[PDB]
Amino acid sequence: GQELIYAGMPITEVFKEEMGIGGVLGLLWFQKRLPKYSCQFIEMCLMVTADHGPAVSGAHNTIICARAGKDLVSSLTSGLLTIGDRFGGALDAAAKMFSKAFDSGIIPMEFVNKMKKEGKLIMGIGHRVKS
Amino acid sequence: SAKAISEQTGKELLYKFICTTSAIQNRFKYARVTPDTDWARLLQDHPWLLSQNLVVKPDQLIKRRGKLGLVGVNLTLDGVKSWLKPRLGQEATVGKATGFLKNFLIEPFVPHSQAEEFYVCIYATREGDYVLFHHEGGVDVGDVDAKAQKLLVGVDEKLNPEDIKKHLLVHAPEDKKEILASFISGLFNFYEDLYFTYLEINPLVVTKDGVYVLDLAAKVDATADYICKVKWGDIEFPPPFGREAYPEEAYIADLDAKSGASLKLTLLNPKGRIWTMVAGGGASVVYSDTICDLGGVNELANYGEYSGAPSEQQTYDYAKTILSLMTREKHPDGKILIIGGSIANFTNVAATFKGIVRAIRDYQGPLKEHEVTIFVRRGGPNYQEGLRVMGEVGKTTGIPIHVFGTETHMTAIVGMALGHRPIKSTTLFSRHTKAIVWGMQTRAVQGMLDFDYVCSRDEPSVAAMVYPFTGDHKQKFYWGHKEILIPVFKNMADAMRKHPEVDVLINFASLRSAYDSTMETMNYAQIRTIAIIAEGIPEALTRKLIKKADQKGVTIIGPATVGGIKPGCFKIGNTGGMLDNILASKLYRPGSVAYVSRSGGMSNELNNIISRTTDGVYEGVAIGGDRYPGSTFMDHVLRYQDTPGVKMIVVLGEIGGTEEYKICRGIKEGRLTKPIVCWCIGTCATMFSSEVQFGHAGACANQASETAVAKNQALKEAGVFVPRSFDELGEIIQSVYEDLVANGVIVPAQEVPPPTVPMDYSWARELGLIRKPASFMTSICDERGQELIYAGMPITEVFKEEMGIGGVLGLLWFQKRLPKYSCQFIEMCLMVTADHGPAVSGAHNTIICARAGKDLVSSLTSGLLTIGDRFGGALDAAAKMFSKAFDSGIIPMEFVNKMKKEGKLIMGIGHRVKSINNPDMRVQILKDYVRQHFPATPLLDYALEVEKITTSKKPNLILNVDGLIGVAFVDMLRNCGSFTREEADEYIDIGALNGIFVLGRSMGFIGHYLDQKRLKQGLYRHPWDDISYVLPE
Amino acid sequence: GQELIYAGMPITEVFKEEMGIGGVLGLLWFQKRLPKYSCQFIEMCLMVTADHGPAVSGAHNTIICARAGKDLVSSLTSGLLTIGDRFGGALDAAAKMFSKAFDSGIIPMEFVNKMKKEGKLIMGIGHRVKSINNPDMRVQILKDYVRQHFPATPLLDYALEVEKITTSKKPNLILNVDGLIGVAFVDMLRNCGSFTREEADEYIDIGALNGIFVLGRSMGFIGHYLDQKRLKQGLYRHPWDDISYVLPE
Ligand SMILES: CC(C)(COP(=O)(O)OP(=O)(O)OC[C@H]1O[C@@H](n2cnc3c(N)ncnc32)[C@H](O)[C@@H]1OP(=O)(O)O)[C@@H](O)C(=O)NCCC(=O)NCCS
Ligand SMILES: CC(C)(COP(=O)(O)OP(=O)(O)OC[C@H]1O[C@@H](n2cnc3c(N)ncnc32)[C@H](O)[C@@H]1OP(=O)(O)O)[C@@H](O)C(=O)NCCC(=O)NCCS
Ligand SMILES: CC(C)(COP(=O)(O)OP(=O)(O)OC[C@H]1O[C@@H](n2cnc3c(N)ncnc32)[C@H](O)[C@@H]1OP(=O)(O)O)[C@@H](O)C(=O)NCCC(=O)NCCS
């Protein structure tokens, strides 16, 4: 077009309506004009997940790669490719687990015990130091 | 179709599987004798042959053997051998059939009285299976239908044993009723379980000792093979007495059995000069009728058909069989090949004709030697291209081929070749009909939509598709020039629920699952009409479909049909084909003529004929070719009688069954008042010496009344407009029509032009009307062909030439057939670069990745992405640096000093531990191979001179493996003789050397991934004590 | 060390013993000195999987990427990342499927019917053009090799029985190259005598078969990258007339 359109909304309208990164993500991922608290929450998640030091599987790989004299894209992707199972997968895993448990109609205690019997740990539960 | 089995086959099955309280005697006591019998072995296997007297008779589907002196009764083995001496191998003429007596059965003689002989018969009909019994059995029973007690076991009914005693055994001796009732009960269950359609035991003997099955004649429903294979085993279906069995027939039968397509071949006269290769069960019979009407009966070599969209390969295998058969011996007047057919509904004429053309090319020498002339007539999908390739093969081979299309009357080529001429619910569909299509049939759906658009329908006729193998999704289609979406459902229940407007289902399920999916459809009350496409559904299953449909008021069109068409309203699947044919035959608007045919191909020929002779088709239905059509000729004729828009009816009948007589009855009763035109195909069968099963499963006359000749006569007598032959059908339709216009019965509507649909891109390019530029360009591999090609070399040749990995790389990377030493050197490089431990950047990243629980590709690429500069780059760097220096003309010492001045180190020089006196083995291995096999190594020589200098500074400044591979690879490209300097230089520049490292090391990295997984290594996190955190304040 | 060691074997010994690429792969992937027929068969697989034209998901991506002026590694990996499910996954899928079916003890007919009921198609069965009477040459090359050199082929034997069934429905439901490599590789791991059942099963599971395809096809992909560079091919932009834009209102 004569203007860039994000999920039916023109780029000028996107700015005029003060959508923000959260709002833009709403259009491009979900094709929705989300409530402003929802946009703000998305932005908030992107901020707390921004980084967690250079020791983690992904950061380490990017660093190695950067240090092996590679480009931004190569270095970034080399790190991103670790994201998925044992690294960064927990968000999806936790959401899926709890959603299943909830929707199954089992009470939290039944769920806790079900996991123990099945020999599974709860995703999204536990911390190395935080009490 | 129902096929006869030998007496031995039937008895073996009976003895194996019958379940009765009755003690059946002489179980498996039979011995088969042929002219090749090893009597010593026969006697070893059948010692009972010496235990009592015997009976001997041929087992060749010969009826009334006793009356022919062909049953030798109460003989010793010596007597049997003497009886066989003048008979075994002898020719015999039984009626109009003449064959050789080559297969006999020997069984124990069963002494009994004439009073101990009984007659039992079970046979299938639409309404169920009749069970016949007579107490006066044997070689003199006479008319069993009139005499014998008869009992109908309904379609899903069970045979009540009390009914056997009550209705059937009325005249049976009292002391034998219990045993007969038990046997008959078991016999019926056997008949059902093994899919018999006819089972006669005459005589059945019952003595003080038990039950004896003296004779057995039977037919099984051969279409039930997929069910009964296990029980039947390698069941053999013999040719009728008088005909021989040929291996070419068995070959075609095996092809037929392995596909939805229909492939049929029966040899009538291998030495005949008239051969046919016609598409369709209907058209093939019409062409045979025409040939016989023109006096060619004695010279007609075969009867056969191909239909149901066979592939190019299937058509090739079919055609090569015919061509081989017609070039066995020369005929003085040469030979003729008739390649005909209707205007096809969906068979791809180009694909099938390309198969035939390939066979013609392969047999061109013999065809010319045998003076073969070919005549072609065909219409249907891509027929234009089909006709072109036929014409072209004639030109290139010099074989005379005369090619015709839709403008030539179907059977006209026969006269040319022979020198006679020079060269329930009344309304099923409306303009509102919505259908569900079962099966992934996107082409048929698009064809329906193209028809709907030109018919000026408000909405598409297909509301949804059901396909159980995929998940629910939407499929793209075209409504004019507009792209639309049609939903596809995994489950039928979802499609029905979401589309309550649907009252029609078109079932494209294969024969294997059509029964269950049709029964499933009938659980949805919304569905009032079901079209069943599949050919080959067992008759017993179709009867169950009929029972349920009748009780639910559902109209079934099919099985074994293309469907039907209602101009202006609705088109069933492929019926009527593509837009070109819909427009040509004016199928976009209704006329006044309604028709019904068994044949799909012929229904589209009727569309053509009717469009040319009248105001056009009002509605047409193809009932299908099966013995029990879901809806009959009468069912549709009555709908047409009750449809005011219909002014005349056309019926294309067929040999087999007595359906057409219902029309005679309806006229006589005054129910049918509209003019009816009818022609029954299959008049040729009357002239054949043995029974012939035509293409349609139902096209076989089991009684005199079922012949086409008989039916045509009866219809003509009843007042139906019957032509002299199929050739005069068009003439009679036009005559009836013209009389109806004259009498003001019909008022032809003024013609309105229909909506215009764009040509699909596909056809447009094919006819070269448009040109569209390719966005891409490749030169290394071609997968489009009959074989995979790597840079001009076919995959088989790659293997034949023992190219190896190195050779394949030469092809795909350089598009060159490299010298074997060069290939081997490449393989050598991949081997030395395979791995170098887990400590290096890439291996480390792959390992971290595999430990982070990732897949092989993610883990491998995570490590590959470290390749390039500081890691893995040295091969390219060394090659480039040394090549530049060499080519500049500077001597090695000048180069060493230049680099020092420029503040650069020499790439490919240096090692942490390997000294000049302590060499790197990888370097040695390669250096030695290179020196021993390469014709020239100028750059390696230069590099070794540089090494001489550097090692005199520090002993570890040796030429390392990256330098050695780098310069040797340059020497290979430059001096192997496959590349110009320009080419060699380009390949180095574009990074072929980086490719070597990457490809080589990928093996090590995948190795590490597998290792970490097998070593069950947990998530890695780098220790904090190895990280200096220098953050702001 | 003073010498490079591949799974306990020094690099000179590797060359001296004429191990070849197949032999090297034996050591690095499985840590086994495989029979020479097994090595040669591996090399053969890597050759038939080398390439299959520029139309396939992966090749296309590599080409686009090369044309967008990127490096060998970026272009290769951009293509490799498509390998896995609907592209190149079939070898693993077929091997796993047939191995399960075989080991379950169900006869080929039971298996064929089980799949139909479960609403699943057989992985490694079917071809767009190759018929039972018009064979896939890659399948021929390998089938013939294996029949000649594999001492035992139980799973291939089972698969060919399943092929017998499927081809008698529709003639193009042949055992394709992904099915043929899949089952032959299983037969190799199980019957070459270098692996315990447990070992053979672990290797299939951890996706050694995906490795074969990835490694093999990497040659074709690098081939394409080089080709595009040499063909001095410009930046690609997909044409708008091939895209249906179904945006909200
Ligand atoms: C008992 C003891 C040895 C180990 O227990 P611990 O470390 O506290 O607990 P565990 O490691 O067994 O884990 C506790 C529970 O959390 C559960 N759990 C852990 N992580 C979980 C997760 N992410 N999701 C769900 N459940 C989780 C475990 O399944 C376990 O369940 P259970 O108690 O129902 O079996 C320890 O508590 C102890 O030393 N106690 C002192 C006893 C003492 O004084 N001894 C006498 C010396 S004189
Ligand atoms: C002088 C000394 C300190 C360091 O020198 P070194 O390690 O031999 O040499 P360098 O590290 O400087 O490298 C040697 C040369 O190889 C060159 N070089 C290194 N790697 C190279 C490569 N890959 N390609 C090309 N040139 C390379 C360097 O440019 C250098 O060149 P130059 O000699 O012309 O300057 C060391 O030799 C020494 O300790 N000597 C003993 C002196 C002694 O006994 N002192 C008295 C104590 S009482
Ligand atoms: C029936 C027909 C419409 C569609 O059938 P088709 O294309 O041969 O077969 P399908 O698309 O349904 O697939 C055939 C079988 O292969 C199976 N199959 C396909 N790919 C498979 C795979 N990869 N693994 C396993 N099974 C597979 C399907 O499950 C199906 O099984 P089923 O037959 O047991 O249901 C078609 O054969 C036809 O047109 N036949 C001619 C009938 C005729 O002449 N009609 C009368 C006109 S007058």
Ligand SMILES: Nc1ncnc2c1ncn2[C@@H]1O[C@H](COP(=O)(O)OP(=O)(O)O)[C@@H](O)[C@H]1O
């Ligand atoms: N094994 C046998 N023992 C005694 N009589 C037999 C035996 N086989 C046949 N018969 C007699 O021979 C007659 C003719 O043979 P049959 O099998 O009925 O042939 P067809 O019906 O062709 O004439 C039978 O009706 C029966 O009387």
Ligand SMILES: [Mg+2]
């Ligand atoms: Mg008899």
Ligand SMILES: [Mg+2]
């Ligand atoms: Mg047919």
